[PDB]
Amino acid sequence: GEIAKALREIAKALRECAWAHR
Amino acid sequence: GEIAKALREIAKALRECAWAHREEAKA
Amino acid sequence: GEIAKALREIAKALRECAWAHREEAKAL
Amino acid sequence: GEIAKALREIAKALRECAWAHREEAKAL
Amino acid sequence: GEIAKALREIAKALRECAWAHREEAKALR
Amino acid sequence: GEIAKALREIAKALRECAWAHRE
Amino acid sequence: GEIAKALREIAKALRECAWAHREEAKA
Structure with missing residues (x-):
């Protein structure tokens, strides 16, 4: 769906x- | 549908x- | 709806x- | 509803x- | 519901x- | 449900x- | 359900x- x-x-x-927090 | 579109x-x-966070990490 | x-x-x-977070990144 | x-x-x-972030942006 | x-x-x-974000930011002074 | x-x-x-940010 | 699974x-x-945020704070 x-x-x-x-x-x-x-x-x-x-x-x-x-x-991103990498 | 509009609900799916809003999601x-x-x-x-x-x-x-x-x-934005990637820009934070590089700043 | x-x-x-x-x-x-x-x-x-x-x-x-x-x-707001971009502004934090730019404030830093 | x-x-x-x-x-x-x-x-x-x-x-x-x-x-919360903006208050930080104005501080930082 | x-x-x-x-x-x-x-x-x-x-x-x-x-x-929490407000306090973390203030804890970093 | x-x-x-x-x-x-x-x-x-x-x-x-x-x-996490309280920590 | 597929919706519950996505949630x-x-x-x-x-x-x-x-x-990730916790490790950022400890780093």
């Missing part, structure tokens, strides 16, 4: 926020 | 927040 | 958090 | 997180 | 993240 | 993000 | 964000 896909996109962005 | 906008904003 | 509008408000707030 | 109200509360809290 | 209650719990957690 | 449980998990994770 | 993925990402 499109909503689930967007939520996974949100998670991916948050993983970027954590990896 | 994608949130993801986009969070990628900004990632970009 | 009201939920979509609230979600966009969340996105706006997060753009406001990115802006 | 209650869900939209809670989502707006989340946006408001995130504007607080921005505020 | 349970979903709304959980979302409010998220808002509360974020207000805690704002408070 | 499963969605409500995951949302509470998100809240719990955010409290960890707060404790 | 749990978001929670997991935020737990990453706490681990």
Whole structure:
């Protein structure tokens, strides 16, 4: 579903926020 | 749908927040 | 719809958090 | 609706997180 | 509702993240 | 509900993000 | 459900964000 896909996109962005902290 | 579209906008904003932190790490 | 509008408000707030943090990075 | 109200509360809290950074930006 | 209650719990957690950021920044003086 | 449980998990994770900077 | 699974993925990402911030603070 499109909503689930967007939520996974949100998670991916948050993983970027954590990896930026590298 | 517009809910999914708004959620994608949130993801986009969070990628900004990632970009800002990278600029923080380099500063 | 009201939920979509609230979600966009969340996105706006997060753009406001990115802006504020860039200013921290520039203040440092 | 209650869900939209809670989502707006989340946006408001995130504007607080921005505020916290701005106060820092003006200090630092 | 349970979903709304959980979302409010998220808002509360974020207000805690704002408070913590403010104190961390002040702890670094 | 499963969605409500995951949302509470998100809240719990955010409290960890707060404790990290308290730490 | 797929939505609940995605939300749990978001929670997991935020737990990453706490681990990363904690190490930043200790570094």
